[PDB]
Amino acid sequence: SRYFIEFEELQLLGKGAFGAVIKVQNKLDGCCYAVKRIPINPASRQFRRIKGEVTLLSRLHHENIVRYYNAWIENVHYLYIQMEYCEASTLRDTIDQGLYRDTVRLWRLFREILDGLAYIHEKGMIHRNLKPVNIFLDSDDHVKIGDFAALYVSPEYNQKVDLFSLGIIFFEMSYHPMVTASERIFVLNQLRDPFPEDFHAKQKSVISWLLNHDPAKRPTATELLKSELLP
Numbered sequence: 390s391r392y393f394i395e396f397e398e399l400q401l402l403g404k405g406a407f408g409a410v411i412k413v414q415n416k417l418d419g420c421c422y423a424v425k426r427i428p429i430n431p432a433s434r435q436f437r438r439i440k441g442e443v444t445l446l447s448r449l450h451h452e453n454i455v456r457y458y459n460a461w462i463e464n465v466h467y468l469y470i471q472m473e474y475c476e477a478s479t480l481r482d483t484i485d486q487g488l489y490r491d492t493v494r495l496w497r498l499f500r501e502i503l504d505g506l507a508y509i510h511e512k513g514m515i516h517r518n519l520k521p522v523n524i525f526l527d528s529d530d531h532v533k534i535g536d537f538a539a540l541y542v543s544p545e546y547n548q549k550v551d552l553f554s555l556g557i558i559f560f561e562m563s564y565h566p567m568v569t570a571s572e573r574i575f576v577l578n579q580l581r582d583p584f585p586e587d588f589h590a591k592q593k594s595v596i597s598w599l600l601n602h603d604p605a606k607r608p609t610a611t612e613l614l615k616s617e618l619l620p
C-alpha cells in the first residue's frame with residue numbers, strides 16, 4: 390500500500406522476530422529513512438503492546454535519540470515506523486575501525502550515549518537492549534540511540550541494567566578490535582565476576598563502576614555525567 394507507493398526500498402538493515410528494518414527513500418521529500426516493519430493483528434493485546442513503541446517515540450525529542458517521523462498500519466497485517474536514517478557507521482563498525490586510539494572522540498561519543506540514556510531514563514523508560522549495532526552515528530559524527538549478544542545483558546528490575554550494557558560498550562570503545570569471537574567471549578566474560586593485560590586509569594574506574602553485579606552499586610546516567618571521572 391502506502392509503503393510500496395510512497396517509498397523505494399534500498400537496503401535491508403536487519404531481520405528477526407521483531408520483523409525487519411529497511412533503509413527506504415520517500416519518493417516525494419526525496420530523503421532516506423529507517424523504517425521498522427512489524428507484523429500485527431488489529432484490536433489485539435499484542436497490537437496495543439507494540440503501538441506503545443509509537444506513542445513512546447512520538448514524544449522523545451533529544452539530539453542523541455533517533456528522530457521519529459511517522460507510523461501507520463496497512464493491509465491489517467503490518468505496522469511501519471519511519472525514523473531518521475543516520476548516514477555514517479553503527480558504533481559497532483566505528484569501534485572495529487580503531488575508535489580506541491581516538492580518546493577525545495571516544496569520550497565525546499560516551500558522554501553522548503550517557504546524555505541519551507539520562508533523557509529516556511528521566512521519561513521513565515528502560516532501553517533493555519543497548520549494544521553497539523543499536524547505536525548510530527549521523528553525518529556530523531553524533532551518537533543516536535535506536536533499537537530493532539547475551540554479553541551486554543545484566544546478570545539480574547530497574548533502569549541501571551542500561552548502565553551495565555554501557556560499561557561493556559565503553560570497554561569495547563576503549564580497547565582494540567577483538568577480531569575473533571573466542572577473544573571477544575574470553576575478554577568480556579572476564580569483566581563479569583566478584584580486564585585484559587594490554588589495558589586508561591579513568592576509563593577503568595568508569596567501567597568497573599558500571600559492571601557491578603548488584604545494580605544498586607552502579608551509578609545512574611545523570612550520576613556519572615556529574616561524577617568527575619569524565620572531562
Ligand SMILES: Cn1c(Nc2ccc(C(F)(F)F)cc2)nc2cc(Oc3cc(NC(=O)C4CC4)ncn3)ccc21
Nearest residue numbers: 423425470472473474475478479509516525534535536
Ligand atoms: C522504530 N525504531 C527504533 N526504536 C527505538 C526504541 C527505543 C529507543 C530509545 F532510545 F528510546 F530506547 C529508540 C528507538 N529504533 C530504530 C532504528 C532504526 O534504524 C536506524 C538505522 C540507521 N542507520 C543505519 O543503520 C546505517 C547502516 C548504519 N539510523 C537510524 N535508525 C529504524 C527504526 C527504529
